[model samples]
Target: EEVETFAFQAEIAQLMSLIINTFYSNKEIFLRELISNSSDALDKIRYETLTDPSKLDSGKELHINLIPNKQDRTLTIVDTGIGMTKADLINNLGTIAKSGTKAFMEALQAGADISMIGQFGVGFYSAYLVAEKVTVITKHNDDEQYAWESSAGGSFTVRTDTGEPMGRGTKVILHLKEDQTEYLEERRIKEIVKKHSQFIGYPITLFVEK
Candidate 1:
């Protein structure tokens, strides 16, 4: 139940610098990359269910949701997919260029039997382009939910989640930079999602405040 902090793996520190500093041409690509990640997580869970039906014991639907909050200046992408354990949070999100699907494939020893939409690499850090801080809340079937947070400041902390349970899957919240408030617009998010991930396999619902 204690908060555990960790320094970014050296490679990630450097990669984060490059992403946050030099990567700016297509800032909106963050949505595409994250949606792709969610799609891949969905793929992983579907693949796992073929072998272990228990993975679906939670009975959560497989889909992705985008919630934009103008008051908080935040955008959250939620996926009902294969979430992360604490180690998964440390290893995949903390380490730059490490692909969770690739690792999963290797662990299963099944050579390319299934395809993953996105390889969790530099693409994830694209979030830094729009957000000052990013928080990830995830729950794998095998482990309790945990939250990972950082500002791309060379270190991050992972701790037991004290908030509402997600049941299963990952939720990424981008605390948008003051200047990046445009990303919180529903029309803009829809445009970008359609432009890049129009062909994505699952339903990607964008929630709007009424």
Candidate 2:
């Protein structure tokens, strides 16, 4: 239930501004990028369960989900994949490990996303392409459920999630900005997922309530 606010790693903040202004011209690919991250998370868990069955805690179906709430004006992407520890929320979201900053810059200059040194989430920032505010609610097998939030180029905050327990996975909420209403359309999600994540090795469903 504790709350904490942290600054973006210098490189993360800097190039995020750059990527938004200069790169990321393709925009909707943010969905692609985040979805791909979900796939990676599932793959990691799949591989882990091969060695550690405990990794597959609840035996939940490995799936990807999208929920668009027009009333809240938010789009959420959820995945039943390995989530993150609180230490991870602090280190990963607050900053790209400084040691990996140079590698991120190299990828940035090369017009790419991340580095190989470790697990840095290059795609998460892409939410900024459409959402001025983004929130991540995740539950890791080794850790409790937590929330991470940030506005474009601003400090991010993290805190324990006391609401409905997140069970086992990650959920990302995108608060679309003023000119980003197009991203809220369900067809747009279908098109983007087909274009970038069709063969992601799991069922990706968009759930919009009537």
Candidate 3:
């Protein structure tokens, strides 16, 4: 129940700002980044279970689901994969572990296209391109459920999740910006998923409520 707040790592603030403000040309890539992230998660869990079958932990099915809530103007991407521990969340989201600021600048100076998400290790932050706030609810096999929320304000908060829990995996909910409602449309979501994630290893399903 306790909520702890933490600041972004050095240069992360500037990196987030640059991604949000200067990367509007291809905001749809946010979905691609997230979907790819989910795919990677699935691959991770699948690999772990190979050694320790018990790691399946009731989330035997490895897949991704996209749920769009038009009324709330939110889009959620859920995956039954290797969820994150608290430290994992802090380290992964708070810092760019793979690519440093220097790599980001080099990529930019070279006129790299928007595919820099994974290369720059800022794929997750791409959500801020279309969302005012992003919430991540994740449960790891060795950890309890937790929710991480941020509004790209240079800091984020992590709190124990008291809501319904999943067996194991991660759920990322995007509170779409007012002008980014297109992402809330089922058709648009499908289009982006099909275009970018059609051949993903795990099954990708989109759920729509009646």
Candidate 4:
């Protein structure tokens, strides 16, 4: 197979800068975004498996794992949910052209339901606010596993992975910036998870070391 490179529109760069800088004021919001994304993925898989039960074999246990590494100053959020393809990752994370900002604004003005703001497809990028580098390993039920890496600099890299195991879900590794080391604390992560996502449909677990 051949590798491909793609460029982003200038407007997308502007949009990403505005989003990464202004969207998240508190670092804790990352937890909400991660959990919400995971929930959405799980919902997608569940809906699909409803028609074809055999699909459930691709990691049926729906859960989220929050692991913090103090030495590396990194936090990883892993979920057993529907994974994305390479193109899906690029289209979802590197650009927001599909966000339908104009439609969202029109709906807001008309009071036509602005509850789906993030559902317009811009939620995953929230991870860039606190992490200098973000890595995503995803295994799709119908395609080869792939990895996506980005620094929130208006660009990202997607490649096939040979050893990164993700049965049928996704794993996001956030490389924390120096100032974002607070996420490495187990208590802080637990508090944020419980506060924002306690009622989420799937189980959320945190990895702690003795």
Q: Please estimate how well model 3 matches the true structure, expressed as its whole-model Cα lDDT.
A: 0.85
Query: lDDT at 145 for candidate 1?
Result: 93
Candidate 2 colliding pairs: none
Q: Lowest-lDDT window of 10 residues in candidate 2?
A: 112-121
lDDT of 4 by residue, 63-181 (tens): 88899998888899999888987777777765555676555445645764323446555556567678878888898898889888767566667888876577888899999878888
lDDT value for candidate 1?
0.81
Name the candidate that leads on TM-score: 3
- Residue 184 lDDT, candidate 1, scale 0-100: 82
**Clash list (residue pairs), candidate 3:** none
How many backbone clashes does every candidate have?
0, 0, 0, 0
- Per-residue lDDT of 98-142 in model 3, one digit per residue for the tens? 656667756776887756766666788889889989999999998
Q: Which 10 successive residues of model 4 have the least lDDT summed?
A: 112-121
**Cα lDDT of model 2 by residue, 1-210, tens digit:** 578988887878875676555434567767877888889888878888888887887556798999988888888899988888888877876776534555667766776543221243466676777887888998889888999888856588889998788668889999987777777788888788877665699889889669
Give residue 161's error in model 1 in angstroms. Answer: 0.2
Q: Whole-model Cα lDDT per candidate?
A: 0.81, 0.77, 0.85, 0.75
Per-candidate TM vs. native? Answer: 0.87, 0.86, 0.94, 0.84
Candidate 4's C-alpha runs over 4 A off are 1-5, 19-24, 101-120
Report residue 21 deviation for candidate 2 (angstroms): 5.2
Tens digit of lDDT per residue, candidate 1, span 22-86?
Answer: 53456887888888889989999888999899889965489999999999999999998999999
